[PDB]
Design a protein around this ligand. Structure first.
Ligand SMILES: Nc1ncnc2c1ncn2[C@@H]1O[C@H](COP(=O)(O)OP(=O)(O)OP(=O)(O)O)[C@@H](O)[C@H]1O
Ligand SMILES: Nc1ncnc2c1ncn2[C@@H]1O[C@H](COP(=O)(O)OP(=O)(O)OP(=O)(O)O)[C@@H](O)[C@H]1O
Ligand SMILES: [Mg+2]
Ligand SMILES: [Mg+2]
Ligand SMILES: [Zn+2]
Ligand SMILES: [Zn+2]
Lengths: 158, 591, 598
């Protein structure tokens, strides 16, 4: 299940008539397909390098940003995508990515997660080398239930 | 519309018995009993079987033979009798409970030939399941023909109607249960086993499941011995069937004047001589412990434990312990397990167990999932099984921390409050505990305090009346005497014992003495005060200090010694002897 | 009309069913009440303002206006409730194109121990305290499978090989029924103080479906009205577990509003309060079954009177409760003090360290539920914890947080909330090693960390000193107690326990001290003296809390001259009692004047 989360381009945590909107959407979709302009692409490339240096961002996320920028340019029926369009796409993706930081707080499925999983591995090795009682104890040790289950499955595979 | 002539005749005769039979006063006792039954929480009425037998022997014989067949009609008769008499709620369940049944069968004797007939059995509860409502007379509606099926009685299983109510419609598969209209009754599944009295030696006991309902649901708690009056029945299990004893009434199993009247002339004469026998203390100690040498103080303390003090409950709902707890810390060998085994063998209600027991109960009540039902059940432990008896626990130093805290709570409050997995209960446990333990490292270091010698927690040690230290003396005479005892026992296979009193005589004397509740005289009060003054003034160095807990133990031992001679009041002799015992049990550091 | 043959059958009849429906709908318009404000119109407008589909109907109005209808409500709860629901839905649609009707003000209120089979499948109102609650469980569906190659239907199977032919086919669903389309399960037990001591408090399970979901929090005393009926449960055939289908819920503000007293007794209480010496008598009556430990008695009286919680506001709130910790060597009857305060103070609970709250998967089912611990259960009451020195590390952290905040914030799986516990902790524990060590201080000779020690207004040490006269008095007292209670048996004068309880309730709920005047100069000088001698503002806040408590003991309005003196005496005596032998002697010598002030 959590693997699917990696393939979602955008993830968020909680006038014109409907028919006219649908007609405009169909018209734009069938008529205009935008592309990234050299200036916009270079801006995105530099921004991506900055985000990697600060960090996380992955090449798939770069492709998602490119698709969002193309959609934004298509809204205006422009053959190409302006660097301002890349900036708007980046604003949306930065909303998604700070939301993603607090989602790593929510999910974290991650250097800290890897470290705590290693802690669980060490603790279980020390203990042994009922099931409900073990799960309850590890959960009381701040270990997420999903992390405990993943560690158990991995050790079963080994 | 088929009328069971037997059932109708039994109903008529039962109603006549209720509305005519009268006590020696000439008034219908059951009228007043039902008048009491009108109150809420009182939906079961007891009936004396002998009384109705006298009223109509044929009726009693028929009920005994076909109790299960006629019981619903008896309940209907009770309903009719109570409804028209007073302002009772128009519709609430009522039941009839039968007692005074002379025939007391054994769980071994429960055979299929006894199915459906009334009988009384005696057993010890082992585990108790949660209460659960259960449908008895279900009501369904056919989905296709939307006709309400009513009073489709179910025989302890999810029995849907065989076919629709309507002859026109034959759905036969889509009946819908009408929960509101369905009749439910509260059932509790209990498990009982043969009491040790009836248990043959080295024979696995018979476990019998019983169903409790109405007033009897909470009457029986785990670990207690009770007698059930009811009827054995069969219940289908996933044409398989299994036996279950549906018990209408539950009572505790079985005064000094009453015992003496019941006691035989020769037995009462023997007990009277025992009471009038001076020096009975040492004589009884020696008789009860033939295969032992020395350790006279240990035997004295064990006997005093066997007798026990007078329990007291304060006006503020506080229970003051009446029985005493003894611990024996001893070097390897030295006959500790022998002491415990003797105590267990002699005294009924005494159970021997070890601190290494791995049972889910773990030497006390626990909550465990049933392997089949998978529902949490309160399982009684050995300590509970020793209710109003003695628990000889060996390897006391090796108990687990879980059992250690449970036992601490038990000996502190005399009751165990067990709550877990949503189940909750408060099991009474007034049990004298005789523990055996070994010093840390195996050998007792007399130059160290007792705390340093044993691993028991401070609360456990504090709540023990007497500690007896058994040190393996190097004296040649003692070892020679021990060898003499053992060799004489092994050579003279029997007849080596010199029992001034027989074991059965000792048992009956103990039962007679238990009936007394010695009081404390003002002379006894001040003597106790002065003895505690001296004990406090001693203030030493002693292994463990002296607190008011020691004063409580002193008064309990004095009560037990008063019970020894059966005198109803305390005398300075008992107090001074108890003071001697407790003070001697104290061991000072030899450094 | 009425007087048929069975109430359930009578209501089931279509004729009378529609008769009652039309009568209720007409009543939805006629009942303008003596006020003439069209009460039902007001309720409809209020509901549609927020569209809550939750209507409140007072049983008194129905009984007075209709009588027979309200009489039939208890016997046929579901039918008439559905009638009222459809009537309300029609009215709302007419005025503003499902509506749930919740009843209240039931005349008879029954305790959990007071309900039996006579009350099965009927609406009833009870008063209880929540103990545990789960999430918004989606649905409980019972599935019955038509057998594969055999004329038989497999028994109901709960969700959220044939018994006769042993067919191995997958079978096909003969009938599936949905129950509790969206529901929350809670447990309510008898409110503390109504239990008959030894009796274990009764508990019952309530289900709140759609409406009223998440309308209660664990540890909240609620008057719950609902249908006490049998029903399936999550467990051959499924077990039929009796539950209460919640129709209406309420909140008992302050957790205590009995107000039950005799005006004559109130006047007597006030007159005694005017009598100054009564304070000493109160102390004397703290431990009728104990001799000695007068300081412990004063501390326990202070804790019972607690203190007025001052609230600076957003920054924090001054917890007016007085937290006490009794420590000492065994045989000091600490547990006897705990039992005394438990039996005397109303709305108090007792427990042992071997609390707070926590979410766990209810073992009976597969469902995570939050369980309300001792602290939250007490809420606005008194919590006694014996063996406080023995607790889990997680328990230690949680209790430290609760004492630091008087409220625990839970953020467990699918459950984020905060349980408030304004509970006066009277905890007790034993030294580390049993015997008390005069050299090692309180924080050293006891296995408790400093964060817990900090959040304790009073710390007291009980020493089993070897003193002849006092020991003789103790022996006399215990012997007298033993003899007078034999089963075959049947300074200032103290205060009767009943009147003492009346005083506690009245003072704790009426008098609230204040600080109109200011001796801040003396307080600050004393604090500077203490700093020069050793103290933190925690001592100052505890001092003012206990001063407020002492003022409440005498029903003083702002403060009395000796109030600050008593608070300082208590604080200084405790602080000295938690020092080393040499340090204790030094503090006693330096503070001899302050202690001698008395
Ligand atoms: N003082 C004694 N007088 C008589 N017999 C003794 C004495 N001490 C030991 N014995 C004999 O020692 C034999 C073996 O001792 P036993 O097996 O009962 O020891 P134990 O108390 O269970 O030892 P431990 O629990 O320390 O292992 C017993 O049959 C008993 O007869
Ligand atoms: N001052 C006193 N007056 C009267 N009885 C007292 C006094 N001090 C102690 N006791 C007696 O002490 C007995 C034992 O006290 P209790 O069991 O409550 O102690 P505790 O503090 O819980 O001990 P522990 O540390 O062993 O758990 C009580 O029955 C009480 O009668
Ligand atoms: Mg042994
Ligand atoms: Mg205690
Ligand atoms: Zn049909
Ligand atoms: Zn089949």
């Amino acid at each position: 299940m959590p693997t699917i989360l990696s393939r979602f381009d955008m993830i968020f945590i909680v006038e014109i008539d409907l028919a006219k909107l649908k007609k405009f959407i169909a018209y734009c979709r069938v008529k205009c397909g935008p592309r990234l302009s050299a200036e916009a692409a270079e801006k995105l490339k530099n921004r991506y390098i900055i985000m990697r240096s600060g960090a996380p961002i992955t090449v798939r996320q770069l492709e998602a940003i490119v698709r969002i920028a193309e959609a934004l340019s298509k809204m205006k029926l422009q053959p190409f995508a302006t660097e301002a369009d890349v900036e708007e796409a980046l604003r949306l993706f930065q909303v998604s990515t700070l939301d993603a930081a607090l989602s790593g707080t929510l999910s974290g499925v991650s250097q800290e997660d890897q470290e705590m999983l290693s802690r669980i591995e060490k603790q279980l090795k020390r203990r042994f080398a009922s099931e409900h009682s073990i799960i309850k104890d590890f959960t009381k040790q701040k270990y997420p239930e999903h992390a405990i289950h993943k560690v158990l499955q991995l050790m079963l595979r080994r | 519309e088929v009328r069971d002539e037997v059932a109708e005749k039994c109903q008529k005769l039962f109603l006549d018995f209720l509305e005519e039979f009268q006590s020696s006063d000439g008034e219908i006792k059951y009228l007043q009993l039902a008048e009491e039954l009108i109150r809420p929480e009182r939906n079961t009425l007891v009936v004396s079987f002998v009384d109705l037998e006298q009223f109509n022997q044929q009726l009693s014989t028929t009920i005994q033979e076909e109790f299960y067949r006629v019981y619903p009609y008896l309940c209907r008769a009770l309903k009719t009798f109570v409804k028209d008499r007073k302002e009772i709620p128009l519709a609430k369940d009522f039941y009839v409970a039968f007692q005074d049944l002379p025939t007391r069968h054994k769980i071994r004797e429960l055979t299929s030939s006894r199915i459906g007939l009334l009988t009384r059995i005696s057993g010890q509860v082992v585990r108790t399941h949660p209460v659960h409502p259960e449908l008895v007379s279900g009501t369904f509606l056919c989905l296709d023909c939307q006709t309400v099926i009513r009073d489709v009685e179910q025989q302890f299983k999810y029995t849907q109607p065989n076919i629709c109510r309507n002859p026109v419609c034959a759905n036969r598969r889509r009946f819908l249960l009408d929960t509101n209209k369905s009749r439910f009754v509260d059932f509790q599944k209990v498990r009982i086993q043969e009491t040790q009295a009836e248990l043959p030696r080295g024979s696995i006991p018979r476990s019998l499941e019983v169903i409790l309902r109405a007033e009897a649901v909470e009457s029986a708690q785990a670990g207690d011995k009770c007698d059930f009056t009811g009827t054995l029945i069969v219940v289908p299990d996933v044409l398989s069937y299994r036996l279950v004893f549906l018990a209408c009434c539950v009572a505790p199993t079985n005064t000094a004047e009453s015992i003496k009247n019941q006691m035989t002339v020769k037995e009462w004469e023997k007990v009277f001589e025992m009471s009038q026998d001076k020096n009975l203390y040492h004589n009884l100690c020696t008789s009860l412990f033939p295969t032992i040498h020395g350790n006279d103080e240990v035997k004295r303390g064990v006997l005093l434990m066997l007798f026990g003090g007078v329990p007291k409950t304060t006006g503020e709902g506080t229970s003051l312990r009446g029985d005493i707890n003894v611990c024996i810390v001893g070097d390897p060998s030295t006959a500790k397990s022998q002491f415990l085994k003797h105590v267990e063998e002699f005294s009924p209600r005494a159970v021997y167990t070890s601190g290494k027991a791995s049972s889910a109960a773990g030497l006390t009540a626990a909550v465990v999932r049933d392997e089949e039902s998978h529902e949490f059940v309160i399982e009684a432990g050995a300590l509970m099984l020793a209710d109003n008896g003695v628990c000889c626990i060996d390897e006391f130093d090796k108990m687990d921390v879980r059992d250690q805290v449970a036992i601490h709570e038990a000996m502190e409050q005399q009751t165990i409050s067990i709550t877990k997995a949503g189940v909750k209960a408060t099991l009474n446990a007034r049990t004298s505990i005789l523990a055996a333990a070994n010093p840390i490292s195996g050998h007792y270091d007399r130059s160290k305090s007792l705390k340093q010698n044993i691993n028991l927690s401070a609360p456990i040690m504090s709540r023990f009346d007497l500690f007896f230290i058994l040190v393996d003396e190097c004296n040649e005479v003692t070892d020679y005497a021990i060898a003499r005892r053992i060799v004489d026992l092994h050579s003279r296979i029997e007849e080596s014992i010199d029992r001034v009193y027989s074991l059965d005589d000792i048992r009956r004397y103990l039962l007679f003495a238990r009936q007394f509740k010695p009081k404390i005289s003002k002379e006894s009060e001040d003597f106790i005060v002065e003895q505690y003054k001296h004990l406090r003034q001693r203030d030493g160095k002693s292994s463990w200090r002296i607190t008011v807990r020691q004063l409580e133990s002193m008064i309990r031992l004095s009560e037990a010694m008063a019970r020894m001679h059966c005198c109803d009041e305390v005398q300075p002799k008992h107090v001074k002897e108890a003071f001697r015992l407790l003070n001697k049990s104290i061991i000072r550091v030899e450094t | 009309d009425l007087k048929g043959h069975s109430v359930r059958e009578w209501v089931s009849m279509a004729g009378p069913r529609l008769e009652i429906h039309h009568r209720f709908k007409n009543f939805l318009r006629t009942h303008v009440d003596s006020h003439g404000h069209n009460v039902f119109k007001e309720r409809i407008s209020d509901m549609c303002k927020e569209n809550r589909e939750s209507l409140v109907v007072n049983y008194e109005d129905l009984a007075a206006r209709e009588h027979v209808l309200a009489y039939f409500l208890p016997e046929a709860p579901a039918e008439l409730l559905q009638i009222f629901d459809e009537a309300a839905l029609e009215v709302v649609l007419a005025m503003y194109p499902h509506i749930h009707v919740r009843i209240s003000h039931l005349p008879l209120v029954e305790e959990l121990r007071s309900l039996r089979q006579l009350h099965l499948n009927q609406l009833i109102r009870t008063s209880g305290v929540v103990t545990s609650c789960t999430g918004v469980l989606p649905q409980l569906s019972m599935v019955k499978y038509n057998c594969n190659k055999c004329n038989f239907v497999l028994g109901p199977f709960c969700q959220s090989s044939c018994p006769e032919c042993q067919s191995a086919g997958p079978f096909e669903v003969n009938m599936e029924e949905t129950i509790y389309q969206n529901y929350q399960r809670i447990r309510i037990q008898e409110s503390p103080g109504k239990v008959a001591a030894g009796r274990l408090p009764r508990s019952k399970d309530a289900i709140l479906l759609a409406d009223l979901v998440d309308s209660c929090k664990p540890g909240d005393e609620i008057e719950l009205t609902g249908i006490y009926h049998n029903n399936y449960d999550g467990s051959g055939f499924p077990v039929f577990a009796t539950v209460i289908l919640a129709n209406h819920v309420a909140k008992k503000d302050n957790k205590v509003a009995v107000g039950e007293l005799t005006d004559e007794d109130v006047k007597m209480i006030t007159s005694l309060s005017k009598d100054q010496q009564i304070g000493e008598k109160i102390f004397a009556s703290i431990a009728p079954s104990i001799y000695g430990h007068e300081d412990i008695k004063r501390g326990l009286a202070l804790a019972l009177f607690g203190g007025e919680p001052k609230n600076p506001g957003g920054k924090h709130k001054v917890r007016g409760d007085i937290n006490v910790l009794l420590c000492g060597d065994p045989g000091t009857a600490k547990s006897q003090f705990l039992k005394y305060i438990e039996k005397v103070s109303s709305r108090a609970i007792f427990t042992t360290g071997q609390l707070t709250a926590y979410v766990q998967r209810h073992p009976v089912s597969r469902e995570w539920t939050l369980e309300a611990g001792a602290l939250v259960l007490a809420d606005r009451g008194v919590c006694l914890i014996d063996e406080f020195d023995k607790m889990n590390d997680q328990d230690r952290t949680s209790i430290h947080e609760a004492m630091e905040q008087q409220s625990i914030s839970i953020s467990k799986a699918g459950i984020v909330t905060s349980l408030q516990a304004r509970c006066t902790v009277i905890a007790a524990a034993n030294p580390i090693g049993g015997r008390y060590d005069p050299s090692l201080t309180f924080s050293e000779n006891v296995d408790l960390t400093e964060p817990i020690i900090s959040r304790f207004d009073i710390l007291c040490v009980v020493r089993d000193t070897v003193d002849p006269v006092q020991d003789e008095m103790l022996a006399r007292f215990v012997v007298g107690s033993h003899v007078r209670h034999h089963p075959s048996n049947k300074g200032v004068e103290p205060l009767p326990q009943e009147v003492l309880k009346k005083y506690i309730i009245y003072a704790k709920e009426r008098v609230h001290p204040k600080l109109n005047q200011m001796d801040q100069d003396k307080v600050a000088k004393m604090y500077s003296d203490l700093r020069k001698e050793s103290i933190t503002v925690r001592h100052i806040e505890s001092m003012i809390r206990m001063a407020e408590a002492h003022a409440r003991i005498h029903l003083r309005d702002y403060v009395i001259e000796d109030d600050v003196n008593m608070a300082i005496r208590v604080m200084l005596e405790s602080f000295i009692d938690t020092q080393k032998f040499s340090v204790m002697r030094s503090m006693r010598k330096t503070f001899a004047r302050y202690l001698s002030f008395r």
